[PDB]
Amino acid sequence: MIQRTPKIQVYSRHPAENGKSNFLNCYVSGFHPSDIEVDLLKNGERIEKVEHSDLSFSKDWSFYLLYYTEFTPTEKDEYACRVNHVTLSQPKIVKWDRDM
Amino acid sequence: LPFDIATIM
Amino acid sequence: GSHSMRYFYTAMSRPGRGEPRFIAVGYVDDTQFVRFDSDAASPRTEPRAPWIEQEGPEYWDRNTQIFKTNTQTYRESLRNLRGYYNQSEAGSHIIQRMYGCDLGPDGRLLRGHDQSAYDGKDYIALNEDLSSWTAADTAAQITQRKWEAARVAEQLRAYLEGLCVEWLRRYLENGKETLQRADPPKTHVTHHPVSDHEATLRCWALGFYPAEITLTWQRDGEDQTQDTELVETRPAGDRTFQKWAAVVVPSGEEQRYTCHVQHEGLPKPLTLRWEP
Numbered sequence A: 001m002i003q004r005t006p007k008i009q010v011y012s013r014h015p016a017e018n019g020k021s022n023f024l025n026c027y028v029s030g031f032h033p034s035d036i037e038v039d040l041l042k043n044g045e046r047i048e049k050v051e052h053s054d055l056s057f058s059k060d061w062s063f064y065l066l067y068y069t070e071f072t073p074t075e076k077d078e079y080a081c082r083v084n085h086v087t088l089s090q091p092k093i094v095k096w097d098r099d100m
Numbered sequence B: 001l002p003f004d005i006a007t008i009m
Numbered sequence C: 001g002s003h004s005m006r007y008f009y010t011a012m013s014r015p016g017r018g019e020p021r022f023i024a025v026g027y028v029d030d031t032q033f034v035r036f037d038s039d040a041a042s043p044r045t046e047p048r049a050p051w052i053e054q055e056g057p058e059y060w061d062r063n064t065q066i067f068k069t070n071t072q073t074y075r076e077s078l079r080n081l082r083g084y085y086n087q088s089e090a091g092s093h094i095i096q097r098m099y100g101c102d103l104g105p106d107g108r109l110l111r112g113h114d115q116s117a118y119d120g121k122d123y124i125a126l127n128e129d130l131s132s133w134t135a136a137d138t139a140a141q142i143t144q145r146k147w148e149a150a151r152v153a154e155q156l157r158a159y160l161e162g163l164c165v166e167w168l169r170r171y172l173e174n175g176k177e178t179l180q181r182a183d184p185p186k187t188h189v190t191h192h193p194v195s196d197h198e199a200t201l202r203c204w205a206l207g208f209y210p211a212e213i214t215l216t217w218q219r220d221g222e223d224q225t226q227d228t229e230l231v232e233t234r235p236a237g238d239r240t241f242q243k244w245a246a247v248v249v250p251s252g253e254e255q256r257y258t259c260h261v262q263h264e265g266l267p268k269p270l271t272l273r274w275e276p
Helices: C057-084 C138-149 C152-161 C163-174
Strands: A007-012 A022-031 A037-042 A063-071 A079-084 A092-095 C003-012 C021-028 C031-037 C094-103 C109-118 C121-126 C133-135 C186-193 C198-208 C214-219 C241-250 C257-262 C270-272
Touching: A007 A079, A007 A092, A022 A037, A022 A079, A037 A063, C003 C057, C003 C163, C021 C057, C021 C163, C031 C057, C057 C094, C057 C138, C094 C152, C094 C163, C109 C152, C121 C138, C133 C138, C138 C152, C152 C163, C186 C257, C186 C270, C198 C214, C198 C257, C214 C241, C241 C257
Parallel strands: none
Antiparallel strands: A007 A022, A022 A063, A037 A079, A079 A092, C003 C021, C003 C094, C021 C031, C094 C109, C109 C121, C121 C133, C186 C198, C198 C241, C214 C257, C257 C270
């Protein structure tokens, strides 16, 4: 069966300013089949109360979802997105880089 | 508004 | 000017984990306005945009009945397609459907669409004539005969040319303040040294709506397509979208590079360069 691995982007809703409340986003797209596990991490620990968009798909049939949570970026706290899918041997962790 | 006829494939 | 309405259905089997899940979402352009999930605590059609909330109880009950009927038809369709492909009862399979209407800037119907896929591969689609089908293989030919016997194409055509356009125009009026408002991108160029002799120029576009945009880099007025790293357009989570395009340039050669931005919300296209 034809399976597609997710593309992953980790970024903020608004331009990042240390000490200012914002939203941390993890956008997963281009994947097939639809089951996927996504967590937002703070210093390697899973954040609770993370929300997500309703399942939809693109013109090429691949699925996409937005996972998001309120966060206050700092110089020292490290943020990331951990994704697992049938196409992945182990969960993929993508770090938040405010220049990406 | 969605299409109202559901037809088994 | 141009607008479209689409419904996206996903029906997914999960042997040993209950009955197949059916999820339907409705969109006007890049704005979702309704959802239905057969897995929800109490499955009902739910509003997902403020401009749809004004619809009365009869609208919500009509949608819910349609999606409950689809939940049951898709469960039979998944069983049928498993059989058409001689598949084992063990695997999980997915049927997806996307349909709707496109209007031009005049508000007239440009074209209608109805496409279905099985496990992410094209299965059956309504032709642009809204009269005939394109079946991908001998399994899809069975569906085609079934759909022809039920006169699906004639009924779908009446919907695509009638109710689909009518309701889309109603939504466009009710949500005119957002749906008919194009938000231009807020743009800037960042510079990131990668070596002593090279640096990345990144062209950003933030806060735009709708998602359609063109971001390109040119060196001395010629397109740098092969050399540009272009990220997929991404949702900000507040209705708007974001995108960036990056080029690795030789240090000192930065001013030979220009970023070009095209979007509906802009009075005129933008030309940007790194501003040290």
